[model samples]
Structure formats: structure tokens, C-alpha cells
Target chain A: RVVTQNEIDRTIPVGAIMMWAADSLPSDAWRFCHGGTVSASDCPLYASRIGTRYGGSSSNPGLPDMRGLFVRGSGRGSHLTNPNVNGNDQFGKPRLGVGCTGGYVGEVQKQQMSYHKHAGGFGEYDDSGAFGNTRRSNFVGTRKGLDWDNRSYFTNDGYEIDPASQRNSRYTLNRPELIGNETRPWNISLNYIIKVKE
Target chain B: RVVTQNEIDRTIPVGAIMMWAADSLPSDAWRFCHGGTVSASDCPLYASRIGTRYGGSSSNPGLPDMRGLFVRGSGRGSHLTNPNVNGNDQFGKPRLGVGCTGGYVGEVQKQQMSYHKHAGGFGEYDDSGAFGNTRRSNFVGTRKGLDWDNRSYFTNDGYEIDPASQRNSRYTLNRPELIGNETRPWNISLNYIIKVKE
Candidate 1:
């Protein structure tokens, strides 16, 4: 029998996801909810200890650290278009990264322009609930035309991706623009995790 | 508006209760789920650390030290009669303690008799799902005629209690026999906590 998504989500208890930090604390890692082989780092939302500073502290803070991102007050930034090789708004947060098609260079440039609120950027995009539009653009402009409504969040391999309906590829960050590009050079060992409730 | 018990229970998601042990570790102390002035020690079910050995290991046992009497396998012996106080089965595990009316010497003796199976006692009582019968006796035998159906697992002050109908007093372990009796000498500090999901 196929398990309904609702049922899958229901099994999660309220406090299962103990610490969603990037760096694994020994005890928290040992007590991680799902027991088989999944480690603490396996979680897409896992981030190293988020600093006490507010989000967007460093200009163009890319992905909000998992700690402050989905919760109350993490600052905002776009998921795509780094614009610079070594910069603050690159795909460096602990959350999953979404990639755009090279064809959307024009749109990516347009969105990148709003990356910083100081310059009329998408500073509060995430908090303002505009996260999906930024995500939807990548889908519309991508070659495979990945499903824009996929809510999978992260793939089984621990990389972030939309659910099957909206995923361009299995891995959310596996795009030439985010990595492998001559100028992007944002390649870093980052992974995503889905926080299991209980 | 007063919160209903049903609403309070509903807010708790499944699998939230993670570590059920006695005593508290500093690291685990900081990660407590519900917050207030309630310290790790306030949680009755808070354990120092779980040992790699099975539930009842004494060798290099990493589990928190079990701190009280009667419920079987904590080390055999009766709390009321003291059928031999120096023992392991005298409530040796890590869980909540239920208090009874001081007058029920006969009932306490009867329950302790079945506490340890190794000694041909009521060992299966706790394991038999009939475990709460031992809990119910205090209610039927007590004076307040307290409702024996109270499901308020934890009191507002962080002590354990049977369901509403069964609790004689607010704290499960706060009774004359357990704390103030002369020969009984069962006085001990105990606390309880329900584990929350990640």
C-alpha cells in the first residue's frame, strides 16, 4: 500500500528535530531521529551553529542558515544568481539550494538586482512569502521544465529538490550556474536535510 | 481562556519523547523541550545518559542512576514493608514514580510481591499492561476519592501524576508513606518529563 504524504508527515512528533545546526554536536548527532544510517548532516535543513547575529548581517547573505531561515526572523536573499565568484550571497547556507537554467541569465540578472534590499533587492523575499516565485522562475527557465509545484524539499540522497512534480534534477544545487561555471566558483561541500519531526 | 486538556495533548506531535532516563546531563539539560524555570532535574524522566548496555545494565552503565522504589526491576524489595531495603529491584529503572496513600500497607505489600519475577513475584505486573493497576490501587484505597482518570501526565510544576481521576496529590511521589514515614524511609527526590519529538 502506498503511504500518503499526509500519513508520512503525521508520524513526525512535535520535538523530533532536536538541533538543526550545521556542525554536528556529538550527542545530538547520536540521538538524531531516524536511526538507520542517516547522520545529523544528512538533514537538508541542517546548518552549522548559526551565529547570534541577525540574518542579512553580511551584505547579500545568500541562503539563511537553517536555524533562522524557516523560523521567525532569519534575513532574506535569493537562491540563484551569485553575480560574483567569491561573495556573501552565494549558495552557502545549510538549507537546500535551487538552481536556474543558464537561459534565464536575463531573469537571473533581474532577480540578482534585488538580492540586497539596500539597493531595492529581494531582502525580505523569504519572510514576505515570495520564496516560491524565486523558486518558480528556475523551473520555468530550466531545460527539463522541472515541476514547479514539487514540495519534496530534499531528495533521498540528502540533496535538496522539489518533490517529483517540480524537480528539474535529483539535486537542487547541481547546476552549472551554482557550481562548475568558470565565474561562479561557488562550489563548496554543502548538503541538505529534511527535518523529521519525531 | 483556560486551555483544555484535549487541546494540550493535541499540541504534542508523535514521537517527541526521545530520551527517557533518570538524572540529567548538562548538554541534554540545555536541550530540554518545554522551557520555563524547570531545570533538567525537574524532569522526572530526565536521564543523565543512556548506557550502551541493555535497559538494566550496571556495568559501565551509561544510563542515569535510578533514584527510588517499587515498580519492579529497579532492584527487588517493598517500599512500604521494606521486605529488605538493601536491593536493586526496589524501583531501579528510569521512569516516573506513582505515590500511594500511606494507610495501604496491605496493598503496597501485595504490589511489591509481584514486582520481581526472578524471585517469583509480581514481575509481570509492570510488563502486563496491567501496570497501572498498581497505580489505580492508591486511588481506590485513598481518602479524596480523586478521579482515577486524570491524564495530566505532568503537573504545572513539572512533577508526574496519574490521570486526573487517580492522582491523590499533585505530585506522584509526594505522599506520606514515600516521604515522611519512620520505618518506610522511602523519602527521596524524584521528577518526571515526557520526551518531545526532535
Candidate 2:
């Protein structure tokens, strides 16, 4: 039972690179929705403390501390740029980091620029969002690129990347490993998470 | 029309807060929920986003960059120490360094001493239940305490404190702000929220 603390604060100046994990089991095991380690399926009596009913992304941009960033790839990053690996390693330590390639930088940079409007106190071009863009070195392809505030916001499809598989990664990482044979013409969106600067 | 970003994220946060607002008088003059600035009395087509009905308090504690101490108060200070107040402020700004008097160097120390447990990562000491001791600053009051998640796992209605209001801060916070002989305790709880965290 382990939980990844990509811990980003909505009201502070910080950056946490939230990567994807498909088979990572949380250390404490509680029932969480979205890309959570603990879930209802984990335990028969398990119940979600919070229900994933509606609303997922951060709406407030004025509050530098509470703003969020989500990016999806519209141009580059094929499986050649990113890959799917464990959220954590065999040591149980989180192997959290994102992967990026030149082709996908355009889409990635665009999302970054868009979200820069909501950055926490930090000026434009903050590299905080790039914190863990390189940790997961075992990438197979580019990413479909989907980014968002996975903590509170819900995925367009509520079921999740399926924590059972622990397969939720950001566009900075490759998605082809999880989805298999993804195409280049496809729109890639990176949904890694980080904290707003104070 | 001055749409607030915090109001936008109010629709998410995965679990902590979610809300919406409406006003018929002036389309934008309307109010919304999800953050602490909630009005609940606004008009117009009030609606929330998707998957933000419920969530954990400490699950992702702090805003964006993970700044601020996710500490429980020793029960001293102005509205800052109040969960309602703290929770409200959490919606918009970086409450980390805000002067909410009575805050201290050993805030974490006190939390450890009064530690409890909650479903999500919500602080242990912040749980109103653990704050029951007269020596500590249980924001909710003695009669009813909060759980590790800041929710009350135990009720004070029949077991100990009858009409709990006489000694509890939570009850006190709810105890009708009176004007002359007027009293109003518009009781409200998280009926449900549709937004998520920023």
C-alpha cells in the first residue's frame, strides 16, 4: 500500500512531476478514485471517502496558489519518445518521472505556456513542470499527451486508466506501452501534475 | 466578465472541495461554491462539474507547490484556526504564512500528541476527535470530535455532551450569530460538491 505524493499545493510556489503508474499498489491501501492506489476493488468493504461524481480540473486561475496545469499533445511524441513503466520500482520506491522527445516538445510547450497563466507566483517559462520529465527512462513510444489535475478532476471517462493495472502516465511519458500501437496522427495530451508556486 | 479561476477549479480537486453558484440579477454577478467564498444563496443556473462530489482533506494537503505546513492548530487564533475559516481560505490563497495567530513552532508536535486517523491523508491531529482534550485546541469542540480526515467518526449527541453546543467550537461556529435578540444557525454541511481541487 503506497501512495505517490506528487504533492502540489494549489496555493504555493512548487512543482511536482506527477508521472503515471499502472501496477503500483499503495502501502496503506485506502479507497481512492481516479489514478489512486487504494480503491473499492482492493477491499470488499472498501468505500471511497470521496466520490468521483462530477468536476475534475481546477477552475480558479486568479488564485496563484490554487491554479493547475494540464497538457495534451496535438503534434509530436510517438512511442519513440515515451514509454510505460512501473509507477514505483521493485524497491517499492516510486519511479516517478516523465519522458519527452523533441517531436512532442511543441505540444508540451504549448500546454505549459497555457498553464503558465495560472502558475503560482513563478514567472513564465517556469521549469517546475519539468521536474520529473526524465526519470522513467524505459519508454517505448511517444505519448498520447493528456495532462490535468488528476487529484480532484475526473477523467473524461470516469473508470480511470484502471488502477488495477496501475497504468496512468503523463504525455511526457509514453502511452503506447499501456495502450499499444498508438498512432502519430493521434492527439497526445500530457496530464502530469505539479504544485502552484506561492 | 471577471470569471475567477478558483471558481473554475471549484468543479474539481478530486475530493477536497467542489461547488457552483448562480445569480439571476446579473449573469456574472452570481456566486458559486467549491472554494470557501461560497454563497449558497446565489441564483441562476447553478451547476458543478463532473466527478467532484466528495474528497479527502489531507489527501493532497497544501496548495500547488506543497508549501505551508499541513499542521493542526493548538486551538488558538482568530478565524484562521477555525476549520471552516481555514478550509475557506484554502480555496483561494496561500494560507501558509498568513497570520492566523496562536499558530506555533510545535504545531506538528501538538498534532502528533493528539493524532487520530482519517480515510484520506487528512491530518491526524486536525481530526476534531483528537482535539477533544480541554488542553488542546479542538476546532470542532469537545462534544463532537473530528476523525483523522477532519470528519467526525463519533457523535456527541447521546453518549456524552447533550446539546453539545455548550462546549464545542464546531457547535459554537454553528451557534447562531446573534444580533440583539436575533439568532441564526443556518446549519449546513457538505450536502455534496461537483467541483474538484485546483
Candidate 3:
């Protein structure tokens, strides 16, 4: 008997969601986060300081053990391992997500890649800003989003608020209210199933 | 013999820097951007939507995924992470780098962590804005600084420069010039290292 998608959700993992993409060969991939509020704990992407590849001059092969950790507002965090690709390439090849491991949005896609932050104070809110608009019609790969604390970007000394707070704030997540250029961090997980024709 | 602490040159990697701090931890920890750029890739942090933590409310033990990405800028492309640890006792744990990962820094102790980004855009010129002071730090973590297109924070849509124009935007990992911060990402890494030390 064919398992109905609705039936699958019932028995599947509590926070589990099904993913279908083109640019990526790995279908039916799984996404997981540590907890709720969507703070650093929920971050999925991980990379190494050492670039993976080692060849040409310092400007040739790039750094070593370099990796890409991408998490989407849709709730997927994948680790893109760039073995040795650090810095840039004369020919922007294998750069964006080149050594990356994701849904393959493509060199020209319209998907939004952004980040946001949870603000403190009694009436604090989170904000996000977009990067650009890829004209490509296809989203073969995945899109991810991450949140941050904007106020502390470049202060040399830690302030009372800077030192006395938790990295994760309780900023509310509202799909109805999207701030900054990008969407809200918690909104990346709101879902809808997709059927790939390719 | 002990190894010398070399500065990561500004012409090496393409990433940003973030700071973190905890009341329990002595100092701040940091995480710098390792991949992607501002013109092409705006955000330093991203999370996919396919994760369990970002979705299935019950599955999320705490917050959502990618909850905090865009922290307010203190200077040019020199954004800072949040130190707003709510009164939640769970967040008060000694785990400084609990939510974030990657890079070189540690937790606990009054340590000063610093790293630089060449391709990430905050070069010697841009660095002044981020590291200069809080007022000039407006550009920190902003795509506006090096956004090739006018897309601002989206993809590379309305870029003013060509995607192929990436000539002198490489960061130096061998000698990342250290900056200064008192909380958030900086302390996060430091605390993580301290935990390992223990």
C-alpha cells in the first residue's frame, strides 16, 4: 500500500519535514535543530578552519579545511564541506556553494539568503536584510538563513547589555511581520511540500 | 617550544566576525565568517529550513533555527553578535559557544579574541568603520558596503560591480588581524575553548 504523505507525518519524527530539490542529488534529506527559540543552538551548518584543498600558491588553491554551514528559514541546516577552497577564484567557479553541500540554488537564482537578530529590551524585535535576487527560475539547491545580534558588531568593550545578556533573545517570530530585507529567522521553517518535475 | 600567534592576513578568507559573552564566563568569544562574500553572499550566518528544530514546534526543545543572524552593525561590515541572554537559567550555563561553532577562539577567562576578513570586505579601508567606534560601526555586517549589485542584502541582483570583479577581496587566515569585542561571538568561542580546557 502506498503511504499517504499525511500518514507519514503522523509517524515521522516530531520536528521532521520532507525536502525535494533538483540541484542536489540527495533527496529525502533530513534537517534537525537543537531546540526552539532559534538561537545559536539551532544552527546546523559547520565548517573547518583548515581549507580542504592544497595546491597552487596561497592565491591558487585557497585555504584548507574550509566548509559551509547553511541553515534556511525553511528549517534545514546542511554542512557544505569546501575541502580546500578559501579566498576567491580567478574564475568564480565552485565559489557560492561550489564546495558547498545544499539544494543548489544556482549561480542565478531568486532565492533569498539572509540573516536576522533577536533584540532585547521590553519591546525588542528581530531584523533581517536580503543579499540579492538571482534571476534563475529554478531552486535546485537549498536556501538558508541565520540570526545575529546587530548591536555588538564592532564595539571594542563589552557593555552592560553586551556582557549581561544571553546570545539568544526572546524576540517574537512573526510571519505576518517581516523586518529588514530578509524574512524572519523563525519563518524559514514554515513549510509547504514541493514536487520536482525533473 | 610554543608556537607563535600569527595574525590572519586580510587577504585570506571571506567571512565576518561576531562576539558572544555570558555572565558566568570571564571573557568574550568570537566567530568570524569563513566563506562567501558581501556582494555575492550577504549573510555571514545561514540555516536551512529542512531542520527539525526550526519546525515541528514540539520537536523544538527551545528556540527555532537561524533565529539570530543579522545583528546591528557597529561599523563598516564589522557586525557584532548579541549578548542579550534572557533571564532563562538554561542560557546561563557555562557553555559560551553553545549555540555557535567553527573558527578559533574560546570561552571563560578575560581573553581578547580577534580575526580579520579581506574578501569579506572589511579590509584596511572598511575595517576603520567597523573597528573605528560604535558610530562608524554602522556598516558592520551590512551588504551595502560591498554589494556588487543594488540588491543590498538579497542575492547579486542589482550589484554595482561585476560578480567577476572580485580581484582584491581575499582575507588572510595565516595572519588574521585581531579586532576587539567584549561579548557575544568573541566570548562564545573563548568559553567553548575554556570548557574544553576544563
Tell me the interface RMSD of every candidate, in Å. 35.5, 30.0, 23.0
User: Which has the higher TM-score value, candidate number 2 or candidate number 3?
Assistant: 3
How far is A171's C-alpha from truth in model 1 (Å)?
34
lDDT of each: 0.23, 0.22, 0.21
For model 2, the chain A TM-score is 0.15
Local distance difference test, candidate 2: 0.22
Per-model TM-score on C-alpha atoms: 0.15, 0.13, 0.17
- Model 2 reaches what TM-score against the true structure? 0.13
Error of 2 at A59 (Å): 35
Candidate with maximal TM-score: 3
- Candidate 3 lDDT over B67-162, as tens digits, reads 223221111110112243212256333222122222211111121222111112111123343334232322213222343342111111112222
Over 4 Å off, model 2 = A1-73, A76-198, B1-34, B47-198
Q: After superposition, how far is residue B31 of candidate 3 from its true place, in Å?
A: 43
CAPRI grade, predicted model 2 = incorrect
In terms of lDDT, model 1 sits at 0.23
TM-score of chain B of 2: 0.14
- List runs of model 1 lying over 4 Å from the truth: A1-80, A85-198, B5-10, B13-41, B45-198
Residue-wise lDDT of candidate 1 within B97-150, one digit each (tens)? 222112211111221101111111111112222122222221111122334463
Q: Please give the lDDT score for candidate 3.
A: 0.21
Residue-by-residue lDDT tens digits, candidate 1, A1-198: 544434422454322332211222222222221112232233222222221121222222122122101111122234233443122221232111233223321111111100110011111112122121121221111122222221111111112334545755432432222211011111111111223222
> Candidate 3, residue B148: CA error in Å?
28
